[PDB]
Amino acid sequence: ADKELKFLVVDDESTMRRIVRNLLKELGFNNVEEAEDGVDALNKLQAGGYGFVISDWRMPNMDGLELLKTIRADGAMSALPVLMVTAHAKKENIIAAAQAGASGYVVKPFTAATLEEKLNKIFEKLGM
Ligand code: BEF
Ligand SMILES: [Mn+2]
């Protein structure tokens, strides 16, 4: 994928945002910004330029499922890649996010290898 692709990393835990940012850096992506909840994320997205979202689920203000749904329903960002990265492991959680339009889904804890595999799976699906 284009190494200038602009990522938004969304999680309410600074530790997890730091994990994902550093993994993205290793993969060659340095155009990375962070958001602390779904509301903060939408403000950033509204500000423009983003080409990929990685999001947690359980967050205050607006959770990741609502964020996903919002993005998918918005005509300005409907096809924006969204990878869910969440401690929600239940099949009904994965179904709800899949059906809402998740581009992929990674369960915490995850390895560096899993994140790269699931990112690449999305890049290939979208011809990126
Ligand atoms: F709080 Be997240 F769904 F890991
Ligand atoms: Mn969380």
Coordinates of C-alpha atoms and ligand atoms in Angstrom, one line a residue:
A1 CA 0.0 0.0 0.0
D2 CA 0.9 3.7 -0.4
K3 CA 3.3 4.5 2.5
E4 CA 1.8 8.0 2.7
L5 CA -1.6 6.5 3.5
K6 CA -3.1 8.5 6.4
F7 CA -4.2 6.3 9.4
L8 CA -6.5 7.2 12.3
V9 CA -5.8 5.0 15.3
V10 CA -8.8 5.0 17.7
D11 CA -8.7 3.6 21.2
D12 CA -9.5 4.9 24.6
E13 CA -6.3 3.4 26.0
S14 CA -3.1 5.4 25.2
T15 CA -1.1 2.1 25.5
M16 CA -3.0 0.4 22.7
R17 CA -2.8 3.5 20.5
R18 CA 0.9 3.4 21.1
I19 CA 1.2 -0.3 20.2
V20 CA -0.7 0.3 16.9
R21 CA 1.2 3.4 15.9
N22 CA 4.6 1.8 16.5
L23 CA 3.5 -1.3 14.5
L24 CA 2.3 0.9 11.7
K25 CA 5.7 2.7 11.8
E26 CA 7.6 -0.6 11.5
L27 CA 5.4 -1.5 8.4
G28 CA 6.4 1.9 6.8
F29 CA 3.4 4.1 7.7
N30 CA 4.3 7.3 9.4
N31 CA 1.3 9.4 8.5
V32 CA -0.6 8.4 11.6
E33 CA -2.9 10.3 14.0
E34 CA -4.7 9.2 17.1
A35 CA -8.2 9.7 18.6
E36 CA -9.5 8.7 22.0
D37 CA -13.1 7.9 21.3
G38 CA -15.6 7.8 18.4
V39 CA -16.5 11.5 18.7
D40 CA -12.9 12.6 18.7
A41 CA -12.3 10.3 15.7
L42 CA -15.2 11.8 13.7
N43 CA -13.8 15.3 14.4
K44 CA -10.5 14.2 13.0
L45 CA -12.1 12.4 10.0
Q46 CA -14.2 15.5 9.3
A47 CA -10.9 17.5 9.2
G48 CA -10.0 15.4 6.2
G49 CA -7.3 13.4 4.4
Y50 CA -7.8 10.0 6.1
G51 CA -7.5 6.7 4.2
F52 CA -7.6 4.1 6.9
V53 CA -9.2 3.7 10.4
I54 CA -8.1 1.2 13.0
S55 CA -10.6 1.2 15.9
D56 CA -11.3 -0.2 19.3
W57 CA -14.9 -1.1 20.3
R58 CA -15.4 -0.2 24.0
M59 CA -14.9 3.5 24.4
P60 CA -16.8 6.4 26.0
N61 CA -18.7 9.1 24.1
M62 CA -19.1 7.0 21.0
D63 CA -18.1 3.3 20.8
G64 CA -16.4 1.7 17.9
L65 CA -19.5 -0.1 16.6
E66 CA -21.3 3.3 16.4
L67 CA -18.3 4.8 14.9
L68 CA -18.2 2.1 12.2
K69 CA -21.9 2.5 11.5
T70 CA -21.5 6.3 11.3
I71 CA -18.6 6.1 8.9
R72 CA -20.4 3.5 6.7
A73 CA -23.6 5.7 6.5
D74 CA -21.8 8.9 5.7
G75 CA -21.6 9.5 1.9
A76 CA -18.3 11.4 2.3
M77 CA -16.6 8.3 4.0
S78 CA -18.8 5.3 3.3
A79 CA -16.0 3.0 1.9
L80 CA -13.3 4.1 4.3
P81 CA -11.4 1.0 5.4
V82 CA -12.1 0.3 9.1
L83 CA -10.2 -2.5 10.9
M84 CA -11.7 -3.3 14.4
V85 CA -9.1 -4.1 17.1
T86 CA -10.9 -5.1 20.2
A87 CA -11.0 -7.3 23.3
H88 CA -14.6 -8.3 22.2
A89 CA -14.1 -12.0 21.3
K90 CA -17.6 -13.3 21.1
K91 CA -19.0 -14.4 17.8
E92 CA -22.1 -12.1 18.2
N93 CA -19.7 -9.2 18.6
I94 CA -17.8 -10.2 15.4
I95 CA -21.1 -10.7 13.6
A96 CA -22.4 -7.3 14.6
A97 CA -19.2 -5.5 13.4
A98 CA -19.0 -7.7 10.2
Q99 CA -22.6 -6.9 9.3
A100 CA -22.0 -3.2 10.1
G101 CA -19.3 -3.1 7.4
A102 CA -16.0 -3.9 9.3
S103 CA -13.2 -4.3 6.8
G104 CA -11.6 -6.7 9.2
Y105 CA -11.5 -7.7 12.9
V106 CA -8.6 -8.4 15.2
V107 CA -9.1 -9.7 18.8
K108 CA -6.9 -8.4 21.6
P109 CA -4.3 -9.5 22.6
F110 CA -2.8 -9.7 19.2
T111 CA 0.6 -10.2 17.8
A112 CA 2.5 -8.0 15.4
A113 CA 2.2 -10.7 12.8
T114 CA -1.6 -10.8 13.0
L115 CA -2.0 -7.0 12.6
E116 CA 0.2 -7.0 9.5
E117 CA -1.7 -10.1 8.0
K118 CA -5.1 -8.5 8.6
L119 CA -4.0 -5.1 7.2
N120 CA -2.6 -6.8 4.1
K121 CA -5.8 -8.8 3.7
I122 CA -7.8 -5.5 3.6
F123 CA -5.2 -3.9 1.2
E124 CA -5.6 -6.9 -1.1
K125 CA -9.5 -6.9 -0.9
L126 CA -9.6 -3.2 -1.8
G127 CA -6.8 -3.3 -4.4
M128 CA -4.6 -1.0 -2.3
Ligands
BEF1 F1 -12.0 -1.5 24.7 BE1 -11.7 -2.3 23.2 F2 -13.2 -3.0 22.5 F3 -10.5 -3.5 23.3
MN2 MN -11.4 0.3 25.0

